Design a binder for this molecule. Structure first.
Ligand SMILES: Nc1ncnc2c1ncn2[C@@H]1O[C@H](COP(=O)(O)OP(=O)(O)O)[C@@H](O)[C@H]1O
Ligand SMILES: Nc1ncnc2c1ncn2[C@@H]1O[C@H](COP(=O)(O)OP(=O)(O)O)[C@@H](O)[C@H]1O
Ligand SMILES: Nc1ncnc2c1ncn2[C@@H]1O[C@H](COP(=O)(O)OP(=O)(O)O)[C@@H](O)[C@H]1O
Lengths: 443, 120, 52, 438, 439
């Protein structure tokens, strides 16, 4: 399809027992990190129950230790039923709006309003339309329509005749009508009328006739975030700003009205509130002004749960000239719990490389897998995973059916790992541009 | 969108059953407690009060009230129905004895009563 | 005028093009087109409708 | 309902004499700070004072934001309580002083009472009666009424696509109207039409309701500065047409004061001065505090409550200057200052029990004691976070209540910042493969 | 009403014997500061004469020494005869415009143009309209006291039609413009309708004669005439802001025309005051502009206040007195305010207690005066209202000593607060972010 293979495509979930929250040593694409995956499983329970508001969890650990992997596992195990918002901290630095507005919008995207609405909908194959134009048009008309089970004629009002002539409905068209509003959508064309469609090229697809009742009360479930309600109410076609993104700094009295309106709908039972989760990757890229905002944005009943990831040691907080653990001020870290991810053992590296090789289309000999595992221990899990693709392409060019040690060794020779590339810049120092800007171009 | 949001009072500005605020707020903020309505302007039209200048800017209390309530497209259409007569006065009221005559109700429209374009 | 099912008198969304009977659902449409050769006209005659 | 950080705080828990109860309304301790907040509540409810400043000062987690939100609840829903952080002032869209000025006016409320005269029915008649005035007939299941229409509300009804047989809603006092649909007595006009058929209203065709309506002086600012809502249709284009905030002039705010005072004299409107709360006030810069000196001098101005947790700290935007609270000493003279002190071990045990029964967590007393040890030794704010995980762990362990094993497992799954700082210290040793990036 | 009791509400003037400028020790709310009040009174005489352009006066002194009080006293005793623009220095840092542009506006807000005008206006309730669509027609219109029939020209009938005038409308006609305005409907017509349009307003019928004529005095600042001329409906920007950086050739042409209006006696120019409060927040680029701006024939008198010692000038890194460039101080004369003696504090606290309508016992005022001496005037002033609220919780009629004492223990003064910060060093967040949340 459209969706290609990416770094995380193998992650299908958290790999955890739904009864006990015990993580399995490998399942759903996640290997190891068991203490961290158990803690992430407890956080999913908090999210799905919705009771607790504005918890902030930090996933802290070295690079390539599965902090994003666990975050993808949580997103995949919540599924489409819950708002999950994936923010890179670099995105808050908009030119369109202030940092705190961008953080408000991110929080507001992460609470859903869930609304259930019925419509009668009419769906069937068109047997016939006649229309009388006299000559101004649309004076009267009749629709005959069927399913495999039922056939009816309808007398049409003139605005339905305008809908029919707008959407060029003809005999054989399979249509649905949202009769609460009278938009008509041409679901397709019946195969039984294929020869009527003289203007349709050979690439044209055809459906079978619809089934059952011509009219059904379909029930639709909508989830709309608080941010969408905010943006709708910002200008005459404010919803367009959900796509073009040119929302200004939306005024807070609009949001306060909406908060009141949604609490009204909750108590009336017209709607339900669905608290989601905001994920902030590389949270250390936020500055001291962002953190002091987030402190108190977490205190609302309409706060999502927040989940954050950091690679950083004791490091300088942005927007100040002093250093703190994770790169985050202690003022903020007081309201956070930390989940820590560890480095992998060799058998965990072997398993992750195997899963990555099976998610890719790669037939991998046992000695190539052993070599890639040793490279993993010495050069890191990402570099070994990047060599899988490379070795497959080398093996394919020599027409080989399997990736052998020979192909991994070409890959290892052609593409340096970070440690070898660091050595390369240290040995090549006079030929590279140094931090003083000096370089020598001569032989 | 569900009709709860798009139609039945999930939109703050549109009045109806289940949006009892919007009809009140529309009347009071645009008419009753609105500074540009002619009854409010007429209270401030004198002395050093905030509409004192209106006497000299070539616009009626009705026109000030329209320009505050219609958007810049609607105002631009209304501006099509109007004439550069202060620029024509620059052609006509020209001699020293014409004393650069200007309608006193247009006294502050200085930069259109005199500019080089109309002469050129 | 409100629309009622010719067979059962329940509300009828549908008018059959063939028999001209109004009907409630797919079950009664199945009955209506399986009627004996004179019976559709008897259902019309309870409306005082006729096609002869 | 949901459970956020302060949802156990119902109010200041004061006696009728204004003396604090040692544990009431969800508070434990802070009696001196609660009593001082009680006097600030009196200052707000006694409408006569403008622009008095208050500072809450004390360490993180000592309850400064519990106190500000307890004020907001002693103060009820009537009075405007406008919370911001000092970090929110830095708009990209208007100067910082306009953002402060707008929030000053959001804190001053204006209450109106309308008798809303609502008609809702199926349209029976739409007859002209003037050379332009209609009679509209409306029907419900309980009778009919005829309304003489002003020529302008008639055009409103005509811009709604209203016809005979439609169901419409009219606010006859405000002049608003809505097409609800077409009455389903017409549902068989055709077998298909693109139309929304609704039942006739089953109640009385006319309804009279007393509504108390609140606005703020900032709502008046916004409404008088630019055409709003359905007036400003071209705003849909964005770019230059967006409803940007603008640097509203004092001339406008002065006309709003004049026009509002007129409706107060007539008794139509009731003034309600409220609170602006600025949490994280150390994030305000020197230029903000300079403006607050002028803004607190105006005779209409809310009571302003600051919170700060800084010790002696540099003033933002004036690196040469250090002062207590991060508040410039010039400004600090204006403020009434309430100190909030750190909690003791037994006070922490009490707050833990209050939070547990608010979250619906049931604890053994050994689990209470073990959780409270983490408040003494690590942080109160870390105690409270452990309760919800331990409740989940207990139920998947099949227990009916949280016990020491579920606390102990929660401690291991969810580290505090001190233990995780020890990990960072022990592991950020090198630029090697497994180090944290320093 | 909207005017609640503020910190300067008791200041009702400068308190000087106007024939001699000698300050009376306590009058019009101002206590003490006689040397500064006499200097301020001499500055008022320069302002009221108006002949001197672009003097700058700095009011310098410690916090809570009446620098704002004296400038407010000048505003109160100069009166609405003359413009008095009050600018906090923080307001110059606009996003809508340049710093120097923002200052050019504040300078021009402080110069009035005054015009005296006869306007002839008809206002009345419409009785009926008749039209001869053979164009001509007749309007019948009433006050409470008079009624008449007027012959309408064709363009008046067009305008009456386009503006949808009907019987029972209150309308005005400006005879100079020849332009209608529907003001509303009479309260007598409230019974016409069961439902009203959103835009409709009821009025009392006009009263007296129909065709009123009035002598009106108009005072308009040079900044208003800038904004009006900036764009076709620029008068809207007078309220929303939104001026942009008004191009200088507009201002030059306005200055030239206003000079003609004075030469012809059509207008008089009314120079006023710009008060720049806390002027040390301006930067080196601002002060360089103000140097030239003061040197102009249409400059106001500028007054400014500072409490800074030797302090860093903003936009550079060297220090200077008052926080101001010496190049700028060379253009400024300086008025210095002083701390208050206990008997001056006692009076100011009494003036404040009267304004806040609080009945202090004599011992409460004594203790409160000692607090003001030990802890500062603003702190003791804040305890007046605080003690009233505590006394009311006792249902007490007068503020007693115990109500001041309880106010004192509940609310810390700045010095006691600074001590609390120092004794809490490790529990509060220091300038390096370190804090310990442990017990
Ligand atoms: N425990 C694991 N199980 C399966 N795949 C993993 C695991 N840990 C890491 N990966 C994969 O290895 C790569 C690197 O880990 P990643 O989570 O992206 O790094 P970081 O922790 O720096 O965000 C990713 O493609 C990720 O999907
Ligand atoms: N005296 C108290 N009684 C009960 N709960 C308290 C008390 N003080 C603080 N809390 C709670 O403990 C937490 C920390 O206090 P908070 O007000 O957030 O600290 P800060 O002063 O940093 O804002 C909050 O959840 C608050 O509701
Ligand atoms: N001479 C005075 N007479 C009366 N009230 C005064 C006097 N000086 C100061 N005050 C009052 O004391 C408070 C502080 O004085 P203010 O002038 O505002 O301080 P600053 O000198 O820092 O500008 C204000 O409420 C002011 O009205």
């Amino acid at each position: 399809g459209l969706n290609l293979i990416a770094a995380h495509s193998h992650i299908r979930g958290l790999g955890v027992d739904a009864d006990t929250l015990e993580p399995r040593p490998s399942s759903q694409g996640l290997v190891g990190q068991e203490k961290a995956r158990k803690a992430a499983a407890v956080v999913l329970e908090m999210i799905k129950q919705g009771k607790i508001a504005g918890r902030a969890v930090l996933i802290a650990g070295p690079p390539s230790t599965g902090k994003t992997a666990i975050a993808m596992g949580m997103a995949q195990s919540l599924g489409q039923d819950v708002p999950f918002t994936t923010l890179a901290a670099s995105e808050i630095f908009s030119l369109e709006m202030s940092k705190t507005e961008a953080l408000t919008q991110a929080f507001r995207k992460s609470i859903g309003v869930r609304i259930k609405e019925e419509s009668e909908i009419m769906e069937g194959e068109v047997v016939e339309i006649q229309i009388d134009r006299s000559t101004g048009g649309a004076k009267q008309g009749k629709l005959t329509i069927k399913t495999t089970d039922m056939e009816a004629i309808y007398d049409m009002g003139s605005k339905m005749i305008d809908a029919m002539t707008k959407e060029r409905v003809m005999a054989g068209d399979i249509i649905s009508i949202d009769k609460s509003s009278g938009k008509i959508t041409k679901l397709g064309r019946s195969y039984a009328r294929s020869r009527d469609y003289d203007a349709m090229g050979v690439d044209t697809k055809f459906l079978q006739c619809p089934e059952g009742e011509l009219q059904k009360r379909k029930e639709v479930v909508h989830t709309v975030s608080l941010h969408e309600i905010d943006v709708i109410n910002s200008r005459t076609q404010g919803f367009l700003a959900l796509f073009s993104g040119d929302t200004g700094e939306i005024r807070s009295e609009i949001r306060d009205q909406i908060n009141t309106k949604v609490a009204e709908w909750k108590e009336e039972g017209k709607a339900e509130i669905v608290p989601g989760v905001l994920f902030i990757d590389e949270v250390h890229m936020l500055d001291i002004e962002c953190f002091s905002y987030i402190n108190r944005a977490l205190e609302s009943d309409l706060a999502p749960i927040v989940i954050m990831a950091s690679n950083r040691g004791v490091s300088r907080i942005r927007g100040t000239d002093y250093k703190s653990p994770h790169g985050l001020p202690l003022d903020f870290l007081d309201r956070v719990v930390i989940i820590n991810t560890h480095p992998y053992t060799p058998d965990e590296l072997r398993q992750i490389l195997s899963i990555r090789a099976q998610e890719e289309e790669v037939d991998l000999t046992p000695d190539a897998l052993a070599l890639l595992t040793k490279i993993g221990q010495e050069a890191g899990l990402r570099y070994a995973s990047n060599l899988i693709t490379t070795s497959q392409l080398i093996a394919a060019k020599r027409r080989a059916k399997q990736v052998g040690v020979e192909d991994v060794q070409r890959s290892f020779k052609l593409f340096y790992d970070p440690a070898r590339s660091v050595r390369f810049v240290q040995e090549s120092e006079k030929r590279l541009i140094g931090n003083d800007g000096v370089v020598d171009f001569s032989y | 969108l569900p009709r709860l949001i798009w139609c039945d009072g999930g939109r703050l500005d549109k009045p109806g059953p289940g949006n009892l605020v919007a009809g009140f707020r529309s009347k009071y903020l645009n008419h009753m407690m609105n500074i540009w309505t002619p009854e409010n302007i007429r209270s401030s039209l004198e002395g050093i009060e905030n509409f004192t200048w209106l006497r000299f800017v070539d616009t009626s209390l009705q026109e000030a009230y329209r320009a505050s309530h219609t958007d810049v497209f609607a105002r631009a259409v209304d501006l099509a129905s109007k004439q550069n007569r202060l620029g024509h006065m620059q052609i006509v009221y020209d001699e020293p004895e014409d004393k650069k005559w200007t309608p006193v109700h247009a006294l502050f429209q200085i930069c259109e009563r005199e500019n080089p374009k109309a002469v050129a | 005028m409100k629309h009622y099912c010719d067979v059962t008198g329940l509300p009828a969304p549908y008018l059959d093009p063939k028999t001209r009977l109004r009907y409630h659902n797919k079950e009664i449409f199945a009955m209506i087109r399986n009627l004996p050769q004179g019976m559709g006209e008897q259902f019309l005659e309870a409306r005082g409708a006729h096609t002869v | 309902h949901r459970t956020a950080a302060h949802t156990h705080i119902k109010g200041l828990g004061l006696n009728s004499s204004g003396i604090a109860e040692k544990q009431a309304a969800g508070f434990v301790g802070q009696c001196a700070a609660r009593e001082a907040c009680g006097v600030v509540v009196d200052l707000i409810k006694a409408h006569k004072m403008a622009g008095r400043g208050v500072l809450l000062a004390g360490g993180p987690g000592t309850g400064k934001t519990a106190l500000a939100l307890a004020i907001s609840q002693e103060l009820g829903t009537k009075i405007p309580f406008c919370p911001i952080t000092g970090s929110e002032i830095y708009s990209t869209e208007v100067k910082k002083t306009e953002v402060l000025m707008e929030n000053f006016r959001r804190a001053i409320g204006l209450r109106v009472r309308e008798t809303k005269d609502v008609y809702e029915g199926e349209v029976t008649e739409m007859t002209p009666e003037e050379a332009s005035t209609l009679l509209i007939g409306l029907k419900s299941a309980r009778g009919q009424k005829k309304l003489r229409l002003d020529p302008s509300i008639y055009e409103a009804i005509q811009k709604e696509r209203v016809q005979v047989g439609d169901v419409i809603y009219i606010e006859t006092n405000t002049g608003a109207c809505k097409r609800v649909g077409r009455s389903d007595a017409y549902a068989t006009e055709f077998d298909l039409e693109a139309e929304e058929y609704v039942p006739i209203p089953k109640g009385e065709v006319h309804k009279k309701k007393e509504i108390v309506q609140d606005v703020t002086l900032h709502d008046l600012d916004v409404a008088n500065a630019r055409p709003q809502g359905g007036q400003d249709i071209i705003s849909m284009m964005g770019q230059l047409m967006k409803p940007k905030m603008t640097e509203i002039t004092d001339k406008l705010r002065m006309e709003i004061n004049k026009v509002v005072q007129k409706y107060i004299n007539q008794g139509v409107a009731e003034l309600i001065p409220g609170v602006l709360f600025i949490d994280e006030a150390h994030m305000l810069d020197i230029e903000c505090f300079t403006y607050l000196n002028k803004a607190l001098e105006s005779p209409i101005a809310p009571i302003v409550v600051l919170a700060s947790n800084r010790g002696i700290a540099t003033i933002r935007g004036a690196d040469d200057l250090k002062a207590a609270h991060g508040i410039p000493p010039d400004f600090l003279q204006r403020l009434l200052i309430i100190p909030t002190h750190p909690y003791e071990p037994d006070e922490i045990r009490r707050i833990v029990r209050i939070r547990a029964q608010t979250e619906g967590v049931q604890l053994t007393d050994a689990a209470v004691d073990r959780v409270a040890e983490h408040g003494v030794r690590i942080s109160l704010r870390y105690c409270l976070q452990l309760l919800a995980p331990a409740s989940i762990l207990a139920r998947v362990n099949g227990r009916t209540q949280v016990d020491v094993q579920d606390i102990a497992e929660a401690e291991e799954l969810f580290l505090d910042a001190r233990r995780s700082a020890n990990i960072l210290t022990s592991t950020g040793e090198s630029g090697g493969l497994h180090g944290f990036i320093s």
